[PDB]
Amino acid sequence: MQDAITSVINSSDVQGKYLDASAIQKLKAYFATGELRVRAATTISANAANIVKEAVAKSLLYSDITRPGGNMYTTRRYAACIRDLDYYLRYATYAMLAGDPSILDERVLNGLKETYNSLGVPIGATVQAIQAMKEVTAGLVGADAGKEMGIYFDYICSGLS
Amino acid sequence: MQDAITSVINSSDVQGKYLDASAIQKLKAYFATGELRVRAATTISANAANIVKEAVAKSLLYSDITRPGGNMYTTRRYAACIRDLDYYLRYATYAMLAGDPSILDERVLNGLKETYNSLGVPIGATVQAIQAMKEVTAGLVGADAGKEMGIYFDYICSGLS
Amino acid sequence: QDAITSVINSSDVQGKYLDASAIQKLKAYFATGELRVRAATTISANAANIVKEAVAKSLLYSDITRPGGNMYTTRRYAACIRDLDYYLRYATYAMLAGDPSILDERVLNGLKETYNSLGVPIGATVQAIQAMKEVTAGLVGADAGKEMGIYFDYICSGLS
Amino acid sequence: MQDAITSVINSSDVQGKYLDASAIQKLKAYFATGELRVRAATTISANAANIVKEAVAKSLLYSDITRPGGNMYTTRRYAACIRDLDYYLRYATYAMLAGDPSILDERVLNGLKETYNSLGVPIGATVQAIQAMKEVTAGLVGADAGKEMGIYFDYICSGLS
Amino acid sequence: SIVTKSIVNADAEARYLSPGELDRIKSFVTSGERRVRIAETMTGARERIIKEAGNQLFQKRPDVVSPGGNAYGEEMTATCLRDLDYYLRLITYGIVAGDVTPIEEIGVVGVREMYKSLGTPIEAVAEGVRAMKSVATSLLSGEDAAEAGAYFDYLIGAMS
Amino acid sequence: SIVTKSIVNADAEARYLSPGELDRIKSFVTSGERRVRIAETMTGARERIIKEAGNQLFQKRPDVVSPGGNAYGEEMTATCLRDLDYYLRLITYGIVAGDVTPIEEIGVVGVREMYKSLGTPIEAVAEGVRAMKSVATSLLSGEDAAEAGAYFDYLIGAMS
Amino acid sequence: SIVTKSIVNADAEARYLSPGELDRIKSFVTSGERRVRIAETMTGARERIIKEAGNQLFQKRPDVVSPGGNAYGEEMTATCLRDLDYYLRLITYGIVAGDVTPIEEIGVVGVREMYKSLGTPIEAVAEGVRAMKSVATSLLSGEDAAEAGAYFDYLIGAMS
Amino acid sequence: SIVTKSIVNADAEARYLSPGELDRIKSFVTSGERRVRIAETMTGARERIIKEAGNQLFQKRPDVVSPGGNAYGEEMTATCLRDLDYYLRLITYGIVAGDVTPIEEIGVVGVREMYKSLGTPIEAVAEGVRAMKSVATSLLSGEDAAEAGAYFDYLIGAMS
Amino acid sequence: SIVTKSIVNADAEARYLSPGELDRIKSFVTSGERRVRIAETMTGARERIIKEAGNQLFQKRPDVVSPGGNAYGEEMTATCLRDLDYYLRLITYGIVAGDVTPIEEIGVVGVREMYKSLGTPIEAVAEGVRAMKSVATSLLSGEDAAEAGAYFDYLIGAMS
Amino acid sequence: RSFKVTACVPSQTRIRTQRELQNTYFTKLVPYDNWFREQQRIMKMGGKIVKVELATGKPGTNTGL
Amino acid sequence: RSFKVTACVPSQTRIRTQRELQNTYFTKLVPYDNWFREQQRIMKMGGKIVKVELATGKPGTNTGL
Ligand SMILES: *[C@H](C)[C@H]1/C(=C/c2[nH]c(/C=C3N=C(/C=C4\NC(=O)C(CC)=C4C)C(C)=C\3CCC(=O)O)c(CCC(=O)O)c2C)NC(=O)[C@@H]1C
Ligand SMILES: CCC1=C(C)/C(=C/C2=NC(=C\c3[nH]c(/C=C4\NC(=O)[C@H](C)[C@H]4CC)c(C)c3CCC(=O)O)/C(CCC(=O)O)=C2C)NC1=O
Ligand SMILES: CCC1=C(C)/C(=C/C2=NC(=C\c3[nH]c(/C=C4\NC(=O)[C@H](C)[C@H]4CC)c(C)c3CCC(=O)O)/C(CCC(=O)O)=C2C)NC1=O
Ligand SMILES: CCC1=C(C)/C(=C/C2=NC(=C\c3[nH]c(/C=C4\NC(=O)[C@H](C)[C@H]4CC)c(C)c3CCC(=O)O)/C(CCC(=O)O)=C2C)NC1=O
Ligand SMILES: CCC1=C(C)/C(=C/C2=NC(=C\c3[nH]c(/C=C4\NC(=O)[C@H](C)[C@H]4CC)c(C)c3CCC(=O)O)/C(CCC(=O)O)=C2C)NC1=O
Ligand SMILES: CCC1=C(C)/C(=C/C2=NC(=C\c3[nH]c(/C=C4\NC(=O)[C@H](C)[C@H]4CC)c(C)c3CCC(=O)O)/C(CCC(=O)O)=C2C)NC1=O
Ligand SMILES: CCC1=C(C)/C(=C/C2=NC(=C\c3[nH]c(/C=C4\NC(=O)[C@H](C)[C@H]4CC)c(C)c3CCC(=O)O)/C(CCC(=O)O)=C2C)NC1=O
Ligand SMILES: CCC1=C(C)/C(=C/C2=NC(=C\c3[nH]c(/C=C4\NC(=O)[C@H](C)[C@H]4CC)c(C)c3CCC(=O)O)/C(CCC(=O)O)=C2C)NC1=O
Ligand SMILES: CCC1=C(C)/C(=C/C2=NC(=C\c3[nH]c(/C=C4\NC(=O)[C@H](C)[C@H]4CC)c(C)c3CCC(=O)O)/C(CCC(=O)O)=C2C)NC1=O
Known part of the structure; x- marks a missing residue:
C-alpha cells in the first residue's frame, strides 16, 4: 500500500533514527524518474479501452477458450474475463506511479492464487494475455517508461501462478 | 443450481453441437416419468407436517441424548432437530422434482459439514433420522416413487459423513 | 455464564434437581456477594488511573517500546491501552458474575490467533498483566485480591 | 496421566453414577480410531530423527535465531534445543494412544511456560518450531492419521502461549 | 439471572456498573437465603404437586385420556406427568436465578411448535x-x- | 427449465410447491412433445434462417457492411454467422426448457460489456x-x- | 431516580416491570427518608465541604494555582470553586434519587470535550x-x- | 488401561513403543467392544445382584446385624447395601478398562483403616x-x- | 505520499486519476530538489530548536516547571524534550513527503486517549x-x- | 489493511424458515478499523470465531497503512 | 548458573504416618544439568511445578558457563 516514497520513511522508523544521506539518495532517485513516469500516465489513461481490446484480438478472440467449452463461451464468464484485464491495467498504473509493487499485493493479488483455481479458470490464458498486453504498452508509452512498468507488470506474473 | 433438464441442455452446450436424437432422448427420459414425479410431490407436500414426527418416533423419540443430560434437550434445539428435518425434506422434493443432486450441493450442502463440528451437535444421530425417514416416506408415496427418492436422501447423509 | 446460572446449567446437564452438594455453592456466592459489590465500587472508581500506573512501570518506559516494535507508534499505543480498559472492564465483569465463562469467549475468542497475526509480543502483554494484577489488588485489599487473583490470571493463561 | 477410557470413568465418577449410555458410544468412537493410530505411531517412531530434521529445515536453520547473536548460535544450547524438540513428538505419540491431552497436561505443561521465560527462549519461534512440525507429520502418516495429531499439536502452543 | 440483566446492559453501552444497578445485586445477595429455601421445600414436595395436577387436569380436560387424545393409554400419561415434572424441574431454579431467563432458555422458545408437532393441544x-x-x-x-x-x-402467559 | 425457477420462486418464500403452480409443471410435461418438434424445425432449418435474415440486417442497417466498420469483409460478416448462430441455438434451448433461463445463463447480462469491448452497437x-x-x-x-x-x-428486450 | 431507569429498562423490552424490580422500588421508598437526612448534611455543611476540599486540591496537584495554568489569579481560581459548587449539588440529587441519572442528565455527558475546550485537565x-x-x-x-x-x-470513575 | 501402563513403561525408559507392545494395545481395543457387553448385563441387573448377596453376608456372618455389630440397624444396613453397591461400580469401571488400575486409582488403598475408623470388620x-x-x-x-x-x-486380595 | 493520498482517492471512485491530479504530481517532483533542502536544514538544527522551545513553553507555561506538573524531574523534563525531538523528526518526513499522510497516522490518530492516560496537558x-x-x-x-x-x-490544529 | 475472518454464530430468540447457512457461518473480509467493532458484535450473540489471519498482510508496519 | 524452583508433589502410593511436609512443599536450589531430569522425575511423580524462580540464572548469556 505504501509507495517508494514512504518505503524509506517506514524503514526510517523501524530503525527509529532520522534518515541519512544514503536514504536521501534513495528518495531523490525517484525525483530523477518522477517526471517521466507521470508521462506514461498521460497516454495510458487515454486509450485504456484500446489496450484491452486488441490484446483480446491478438490471441483471445478467435480461440478455443472462446468457442464452446472453454471459459469465455458465455457472455457472463466473458464479462469477468475482460473485467480482470483493465483491473490489471489500472493497478499497473497504480504500481508504476508509486515505485512500489506492494499496492496490488493486497488489492489484486490477494485471492488470485486460489480463486482462479477454485472457479476452474485458466491462468495460462491470462498469463498469455498479459505478455502481449505488456509489449503493446511500451510501444504506446515509449521504451523509456515501458521498461520500468514491466517489472511491476511481471510482478503480477509471480503472484498469479 | 443445475436442473436435469438444464444439465442435458448443458452437456450439448459445452460441446456446442445441437441437440441430437440422443440429447432429445434425455428429455424423453425425463418426460416419460414426469407425471408420477409431479404426483409424488403433492403427497409429500400435504404430509410434511405429518411425516416429520414419525421420523423421530422411529429413531430419536426416547434415546440417550433426548433425555436430560444430552443434546436435543432444551426444546429450543428440539425445534432445530425438527426444522432441519423440515429442511432436508423440503429440499429433497425440490431435488426430486428437478432430478439432480446439484441443488443439494448449492443450498443444503454448501457448508453443512463444517458447521456441525463447532456447534457440538451429534451428526450421526441426524444420519439415522433421515435414514429412518425413508421407510415412512415410501409407505405413502408408493413403491415406485419410493426408490427414486432414496438416492437423493443418500446424497445428503453421504455428504454429511 | 454468570456463576449463579452456571451451577443452574450444571444441574440440568446432570439432569437432577438442585441438590445440597450444590446448594451450598449458591451459599458460597452469597457469602462473598456482600463484599463483591463493594469490591466493584472501588475498581469502577479507580478505573483508568490504574492503567497509567499499570503500564507505567510494567513496560511503559521500556525503550523497546518507543523505538520500533508493535506498541511504539502513536496509533498503536492508544489502540493497545484501549484494550487495557477492556481487559480491566471484563475483569470486573468476571468478578461481578463470579465466573470465568463470561470471560473465556468475549475478550478471549480468537485473540491468541489475532495477536500473532498482528505481531503482538505475547509475553510482554503477559508481563503488563502480571503486576497490573497487584495494583488493583493493593487498593481493594488482598482479601478482595484473591478473587481478582483467579479471574485476572485467567486471561493470560488463556492467552498463552 | 489419564486415558480416554479412564477419562470417561473419572468424569462420570465426579457424578459417581454408572456408565452413561451416550458416553459408552464415545468408547466406540475411540474404538473406531483405535486400529489406525497404532499404524500411525509406528510411522512416527520409525522416522522420528529426520522429522525433527525436516521440521527445523522448513523455518529454523536459516533465520535470525541461529544466525549469530541469538541463543541458537552455541551448539550446547542448540543440541539441547533439538533435545527439547525430540521430547515433544515422543510425548505426542503417547497422546493418540491415550485419546486425551491429559498426558500433555500432567507432564509437558507442568512447568514448561515458567522455565522458558526463565531462560528467555523465544516462545513464538518455539511455536514456529512446531507449526512446521504439524504439517510434516500429517504429510507422512496419512490425512486422517494427521487429523488427530493436530489437536494435540495446538494443545502444546496454546498451552505455551 | 439478575446479574446477567445488568452486565449485558452495561456491556452494550461500553460502560461500568451504575450504583443504582449495583444495589439491585446487593439486595439480591441479602435476599438469597429467603429465595433458596423456597426451592428447598419445592424439592421436598417434588412428588406431591404433580400428582393432583393431572387430577386437576384430567377431571377438567378429559379429552387427552379419552380415545381420541394424544395422552391416551397409561404409557402416554406416565410421560405426560413426566413432562409436567420437567416444568417443575424448570421452576425450582427460577426461584434461584431470581427472574425468568433460564426458563426463557429451556422452556418457552420452542413450545409453540413442538407440542403442535407432537400432536398435543398447547392449551x-x-x-x-x-x-x-x-x-x-x-x-x-x-x-x-x-x-x-x-x-x-x-x-402461563408464554404458552397461553 | 420451468421447474428450476419455480423452485427458486418457492425457495425464497420458504414454501413447498403450490397446487396452482403444480398444474403448470404438469401441463408442461404433457405438452413437451409439442415443443420438441418445433425445436426440431429450428434445428433442421438453422442454415436458412440465418442466411437470408442476415441480409435483412444489412438491408435495414447497411452501416455494418461499410468499410471502417466493426463487421466488414468476407471474414467479419463471417463472424456474424459465427455469432448469430448462437442466438438461433439458444432460442431452441429456451423452447425445450419452457422458459428463458438457458438464455439467461449464456447470453444476456454481460452483453453490455461484450459488445462495448467488441465495439458493435447492440441495437x-x-x-x-x-x-x-x-x-x-x-x-x-x-x-x-x-x-x-x-x-x-x-x-429483443434483453438487448434493448 | 431508580423509578426512571427501572421503567426504561422495562420499556426497552416492551415488558411490564418484573416483581424482581418491584421490591427494588418499594425498599427504595420506605428507606427514602434515610436518604433525606444524608443529603441534609451535604447542604447543611456545603460551605464546610467546599473549604477543606480545595486546600488539598492544591496539595496533591499544587500547580493549578501556578501561572501558565487556568486557575491562576483570584477570578480564575473562583471559576474552579464555582465549578466545584456545581458538582456536589448533583451528588445531593444523586443520593436522593437512588439512581445516578440526574448526574448523567446534567453533569457528565459532555465533560470529556467541554473541559479540554476550556483548559482544565480531567486528571x-x-x-x-x-x-x-x-x-x-x-x-x-x-x-x-x-x-x-x-x-x-x-x-471519578467517569472522569478517570 | 494398559495404554497407561504401556506409556509409563516406555516413558521411564524414555523411548517409543515396541512393536510387541503396539500389537498389545491394539488387541485391547478390539476386546474393548467385548467388555462393554459384560458391563451392560451388570448395569442392567445392578439392582438384582446386591440385594441377596448382602443377604448371604447375613447368613454367613450374623454378628454384624446382631446388636453389638456395627451394621445393625435399618439405617445402617441401607448404607451397607449402598457400600456393597460401590464396589460393583468399581468392577464395572474395571471390566471395560480391562485392568485393576481404575480400582487401583479409586478404592483399594485405605481399606485396612477405612473400616478400622468406622469399626466395621474388614473380613x-x-x-x-x-x-x-x-x-x-x-x-x-x-x-x-x-x-x-x-x-x-x-x-478380596485387598480386604484379605 | 501525494501519490498514495491520490491513488487511494482514485481507487475509491474506481477510475484513472484526474488531469487535475496530473498538475499536482508534476509540480511536486519538479520542486522536490528544494524540498530536500528543507530537510537538511533540520539536521544541524536538531539540538538548536528543541533546546530553546522546551524552555519557551516552560516560560509560556510555568505550570509545568513547579513540583506537581508533568515535566518535573531529570527523567520527566527529558520526557517532553524527547517527545519534542520526536515531533520534529516526525514532520521532517512530511516536508519531503509534501502532505500529511506520513504524519497523521503515526502521530495524530491516537493522541487524546493517550495523553489523558499519560496525564499530560494537550494544551x-x-x-x-x-x-x-x-x-x-x-x-x-x-x-x-x-x-x-x-x-x-x-x-497545531489537530491536537485540540 | 484488512483481515480474513471466519466465524460461526447461531441466533437464540427465534426459529427461522429461511435457510441461514451464510448467516450461521461466515468467511468475511473485514477492514482494520471496523474489526474493533465487528468482533465485539459477535460476542453479544456469543458466536465463536476460528481463523482470523490477515489477508492484506504486512504486520507491524508504521506508515503506509 | 543454576536454577531455583518450588513445586508441590502429592504421593497417592502409600499412606504415610510420619511428617512429609518438607517432602510436599520443598523449595530448592537445583543446578542447571540436573533440572531437566529433575522436572522429569517430578512429572511422573505427579507433581505440580508452581514457580521457577530466576535469580541465579543470568539468562541469555551464551558463554561464561
Ligand atoms: C402432558 C401434561 C401433556 C402431554 C405430554 C406428552 N409429551 C410427550 C412427549 C414429549 N414431550 C416433550 C416435551 C418436553 N420435553 C422436555 O424435556 C421439556 C422441557 C425442556 C418439554 C417441554 C418431548 C421432547 C417429548 C418426546 C419424548 C421425550 O420426553 O423426550 C408425549 C408422548 C407423545 C408420543 O408420541 O410419544 C405425551 C403424551 N401431552 C398431553 O396431551 C398433555 C397436554
Ligand atoms: C481488482 C480486484 C479484483 C480481482 C483481482 C478480481 C478477480 C476475479 N476474477 C473472477 C473471474 C474470472 N476471471 C476470469 C479470467 C480470465 N479469463 C481467462 O480465460 C483467463 C484465464 C483470464 C484472463 C484473460 C474468468 C473467465 C472469470 C469468470 C469465472 C466465472 O465466473 O465462472 C472473479 C469471480 C467473480 C467474477 O465473475 O468476477 C473474481 C473475484 N475481481 C476483482 O474485482
Ligand atoms: C437448509 C439447509 C440448512 C440446515 C439443515 C440448517 C441447520 C441449522 N441447524 C442449526 C442448529 C442445530 N442443528 C441441530 C441438528 C440435529 N439435531 C441433532 O441432534 C442431530 C445431530 C441433527 C438432526 C436434525 C441441533 C440440535 C441444533 C441446535 C444447536 C445449537 O443451537 O446449539 C443452526 C443454527 C441455529 C438455527 O438457526 O437453528 C442452523 C442454521 N441450516 C441450513 O441452512
Ligand atoms: C473483549 C475481549 C477482547 C480484547 C481485550 C480485544 C483486544 C484487541 N487488541 C487489539 C490490538 C492490540 N493489542 C496490543 C497488545 C498490547 N499492547 C500493549 O501495550 C500490551 C503490551 C499488549 C496487551 C495489552 C497492541 C500493541 C495492539 C495494536 C496492534 C495492531 O494495530 O495490530 C485489537 C485490534 C485493534 C486494531 O486492529 O488495531 C483488538 C480488537 N479483542 C477482544 O475480543
Ligand atoms: C452468444 C454469446 C456470445 C457472444 C456475444 C460472442 C462474441 C464473440 N465475437 C467474437 C468476434 C467478433 N464478433 C463480431 C460480431 C459482430 N460484429 C458485426 O459486424 C455484427 C453486427 C456482429 C454479429 C453479427 C466481429 C466483427 C468479431 C471480430 C472482431 C475483431 O476481429 O476485432 C469472438 C471471438 C471469436 C470466437 O468466437 O472465437 C467472440 C467470443 N460469442 C458468444 O458465444
Ligand atoms: C454541573 C454541570 C456543569 C459543568 C460540568 C460546568 C463546568 C464549567 N467549568 C467552568 C470553569 C472553570 N472550571 C475550572 C476547573 C477547575 N478548577 C480547578 O482548579 C480544577 C483543576 C478544576 C475542577 C476541580 C476553572 C479553573 C474554571 C475557570 C476557567 C476560566 O475562567 O477560564 C465553566 C465556565 C465558567 C462558569 O462556571 O460559568 C463551566 C461552564 N458548569 C456546570 O454548571
Ligand atoms: C468406591 C470407593 C469408596 C468407598 C470404599 C467408600 C466408603 C464409605 N463407606 C462409608 C460408610 C459406611 N460403611 C459401612 C459398612 C458396613 N457396615 C456393615 O455392617 C458391614 C460390615 C459393612 C459393609 C456393608 C457403615 C456402617 C458406614 C457408616 C459409618 C457408620 O455409621 O458407622 C462412607 C461414609 C458415607 C458417605 O459419605 O458416603 C464412605 C465414604 N466411598 C467410596 O467412594
Ligand atoms: C510520538 C508519539 C510518542 C509519545 C507521546 C511517546 C511518549 C513517552 N513518554 C514517556 C514518558 C513521559 N512523557 C511525559 C510527558 C510530559 N510531561 C510533561 O511534563 C509535559 C507537559 C509532557 C510532554 C510535553 C511524562 C510525564 C512521562 C512519564 C510517564 C509518567 O510518569 O506519567 C515515555 C517513556 C520513556 C522512554 O521512552 O523509555 C514514552 C515512550 N513516545 C512516542 O513515541
Ligand atoms: C519432557 C517434557 C519436558 C521438556 C521438553 C523440557 C524442556 C527444557 N528445554 C529447556 C531449554 C531450551 N529450550 C530451547 C528451545 C528451543 N530452541 C529452539 O530452537 C526453539 C526456539 C525451541 C524449540 C523447542 C533452548 C535453546 C534451550 C536451552 C536454553 C537454556 O539453556 O536455558 C530446558 C532448560 C534446561 C535445558 O537446557 O535442557 C528444559 C528443562 N522439560 C521438560 O520437562
Missing part, C-alpha cells in the same frame, strides 16, 4: 401448569405465594 | 434479431407463432 | 472530586457514609 | 464381595464370567 | 509546537518556510 399443557399454580403456592407459606407464583405467570 | 444486432423474428414465424404454424415467438420477445 | 478534576471523597464521607457515620460514598466515586 | 466386607462374585457370574455365561471373575477375586 | 504540546513553528520560519528563506510551515499548522 392443555397451558392448563396443566395453571392447575399446578393453585396446588403449589397453597402448599407453601402465605407471603411467598407472590414470589413462587411470579414465575408461574411466565409459564 | 444494430437487435434489429437483426427482430427481423429474424419476422422470418422465423414464416416457418412456424399459426398456433406456434406466438409461443415460440414468446421466447423471442425476451431476447 | 486534575478527578483529584478534586476524590479530595471531596475524603471529607464528605468523613462528615457522616460510616454505615450511612458507605452508600453516600457509593455515588460520587462513580463520577 | 465381613471381604465376604460380601465373595457373595457378590458368585451372584454376578451366575448372571453371565461360562466363558465370559472368567474375565469378569478376574477382578472379583482382585478385591 | 501544553499544542502551544509547544507553536514555539517550534516560529523559529523554523527564520532560518529558511520565507516562501519555502511558508510551504513547510503549514505542516506545523496542521499539527
